[PDB]
Amino acid sequence: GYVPAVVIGTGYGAAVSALRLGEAGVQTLMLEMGQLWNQPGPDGNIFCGMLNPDKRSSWFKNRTEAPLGSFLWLDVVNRNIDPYAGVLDRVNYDQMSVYVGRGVGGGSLVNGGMAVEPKRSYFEEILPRVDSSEMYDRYFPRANSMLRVNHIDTKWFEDTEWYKFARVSREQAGKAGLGTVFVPNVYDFGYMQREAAGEVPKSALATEVIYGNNHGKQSLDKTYLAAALGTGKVTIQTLHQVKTIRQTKDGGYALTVEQKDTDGKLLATKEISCRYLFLGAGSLGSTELLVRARDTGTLPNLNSEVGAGWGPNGNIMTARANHMWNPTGAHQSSIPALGIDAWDNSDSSVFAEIAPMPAGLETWVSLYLAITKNPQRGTFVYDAATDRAKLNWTRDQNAPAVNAAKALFDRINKANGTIYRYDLFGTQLKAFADDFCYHPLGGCVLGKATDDYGRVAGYKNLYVTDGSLIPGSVGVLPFVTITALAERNVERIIKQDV
Numbered sequence: 369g370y371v372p373a374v375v376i377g378t379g380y381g382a383a384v385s386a387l388r389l390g391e392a393g394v395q396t397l398m399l400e401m402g403q404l405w406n407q408p409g410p411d412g413n414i415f416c417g418m419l420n421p422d423k424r425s426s427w428f429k430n431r432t433e434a435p436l437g438s439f440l441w442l443d444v445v446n447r448n449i450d451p452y453a454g455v456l457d458r459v460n461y462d463q464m465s466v467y468v469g470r471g472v473g474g475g476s477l478v479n480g481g482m483a484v485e486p487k488r489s490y491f492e493e494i495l496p497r498v499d500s501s502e503m504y505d506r507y508f509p510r511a512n513s514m515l516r517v518n519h520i521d522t523k524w525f526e527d528t529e530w531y532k533f534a535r536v537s538r539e540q541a542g543k544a545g546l547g548t549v550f551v552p553n554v555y556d557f558g559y560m561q562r563e564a565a566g567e568v569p570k571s572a573l574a575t576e577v578i579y580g581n582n583h584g585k586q587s588l589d590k591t592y593l594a595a596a597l598g599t600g601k602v603t604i605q606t607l608h609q610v611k612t613i614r615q616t617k618d619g620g621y622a623l624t625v626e627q628k629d630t631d632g633k634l635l636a637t638k639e640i641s642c643r644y645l646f647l648g649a650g651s652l653g654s655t656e657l658l659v660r661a662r663d664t665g666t667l668p669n670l671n672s673e674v675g676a677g678w679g680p681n682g683n684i685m686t687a688r689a690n691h692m693w694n695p696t697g698a699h700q701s702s703i704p705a706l707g708i709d710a711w712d713n714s715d716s717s718v719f720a721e722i723a724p725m726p727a728g729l730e731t732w733v734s735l736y737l738a739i740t741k742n743p744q745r746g747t748f749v750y751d752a753a754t755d756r757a758k759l760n761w762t763r764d765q766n767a768p769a770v771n772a773a774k775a776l777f778d779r780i781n782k783a784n785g786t787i788y789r790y791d792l793f794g795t796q797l798k799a800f801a802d803d804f805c806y807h808p809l810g811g812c813v814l815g816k817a818t819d820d821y822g823r824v825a826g827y828k829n830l831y832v833t834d835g836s837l838i839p840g841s842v843g844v845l846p847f848v849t850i851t852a853l854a855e856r857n858v859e860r861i862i863k864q865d866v
């Protein structure tokens with residue numbers, strides 16, 4: 369059937385879009401391929417933890433996997449599982465593995481909650497056609513408030529065993545002349561204190577994050593999506609994956625949508641149509657839909673920029689071996705609180721999350737997720753044979769990112785007399801993981817594949833809302849930018865188009 373607006377997906381771009389559409393009085397249907405995560409499983413919790421992964425941990429895989437960095441300690445808990453509609457999808461391309469959330473709330477279900485605005489000067493560099501004053505004056509503040517961003521208590525941080533890991537890297541970094549910053553979060557830090565005090569059920573303090581948090585984390589189901597449903601104008605259908613998009617002869621849109629069960633069995637195909645179509649299927653999902661539509665002839669006027677301009681936000685993971693006298697602790701909160709800010713917009717820029725590790729015993733390891741400035745980009749290319757959009761990114765394209773991360777951490781190692789770990793990312797000596805991505809950006813870049821508000825070139829009433837808009841890099845953790853951009857875009861779209 370027909371509905372005025374359809375939003376594909378339920379991550380950040382989608383959630384913002386649907387809230388504002390509903391507040392404007394536009395009846396809106398959101399289509400989400402994953403689950404609504406609200407049923408207690410066999411342990412009485414909705415989500416599995418990192419020390420007890422089960423089928424809920426994985427989107428249609430036959431074995432659980434350890435968190436990147438943690439294989440040496442967490443492979444012992446891996447198990448064979450039945451392919452299931454779990455929460456975390458490791459999407460494998462030829463030389464890149466991209467990790468994305470699947471469910472109502474998208475990546476907000478599985479992410480570390482870190483809520484960071486980009487440096488304004490870098491924003492202005494990457495998106496020179498966008499008015500940065502309205503972003504910083506209006507839309508970034510609007511996003512932080514509605515996302516429920518909050519700040520850790522510095523005294524508690526300084527005192528608690530749960531953040532020793534962070535203080536160790538802070539102290540090590542300082543010897544190299546490098547500074548740290550507190551990173552705001554959507555995890556309720558007040559709740560986290562009460563966890564540590566034994567007052568409330570633990571989540572961050574019970575090795576949960578990447579397969580969901582049973583408590584504490586204000587994911588989008590709690591914030592934007594709850595509010596959208598509250599408008600009375602928004603509904604969400606789950607286990608509904610959009611496969612194809614076409615325009616109708618009179619200029620609306622028609623979708624083919626597969627409904628599955630949690631075992632992946634096809635229950636129905638349906639046709640859904642609309643006047644307004646908003647893509648919020650993520651960098652991978654939105655881009656795949658549009659590349660497919662262009663190359664199978666259902667949206668024949670899409671431009672050549674659809675599929676282009678993808679990057680992994682410069683993501684590189686690395687680890688240092690601490691001196692024995694600098695243990696990182698057996699008890700590490702699963703929510704990062706500090707970053708190393710070494711980002712000056714030059715090619716040596718690094719913003720590095722000080723990442724906790726879930727092992728639960730002392731390992732002396734400090735883990736980092738570096739965000740770098742690497743101009744290399746990939747392209748999604750439709751494969752008509754398999755009906756998939758393939759990302760053509762090659763491992764060598766991450767060399768600039770590796771080089772920047774290594775220069776930063778080499779400073780820290782020299783100042784402290786420490787060395788890297790070489791064994792965390794497989795048998796082969798490898799200090800820098802260079803073939804994963806938690807922060808996929810691009811594929812439908814703002815102003816390239818779209819106009820400056822995400823209107824898809826070649827089409828009216830067709831919008832892209834999500835990380836596919838971003839030109840490959842933001843220099844920080846991306847969801848605040850995605851949210852704020854979406855606020856800007858949907859507001860304008862509603863005013864001028866709807």
Ligand SMILES: Cc1cc2nc3c(=O)[nH]c(=O)nc-3n(C[C@H](O)[C@H](O)[C@H](O)COP(=O)(O)OP(=O)(O)OC[C@H]3O[C@@H](n4cnc5c(N)ncnc54)[C@H](O)[C@@H]3O)c2cc1C
Pocket residue numbers: 376377378379380381382399400401402467468469470471472473474475476478479480481482483484578608609610611648649650651653654657806807808834835836844845846847848850
């Ligand atoms: C392990 C991990 C840690 C991270 N930590 C942080 C952090 O601390 N801070 C930060 O800023 N960012 C972090 N991120 C990144 C952040 O989560 C993403 O940048 C953000 O979620 C992207 O939002 P989006 O709206 O583009 O898409 P997503 O949040 O990915 O949402 C897309 C949604 O669309 C659905 N979908 C896809 N295709 C279809 C289709 N065809 N039909 C129907 N539904 C579809 C998906 O299932 C999903 O629910 C992390 C991500 C991961 C995986």
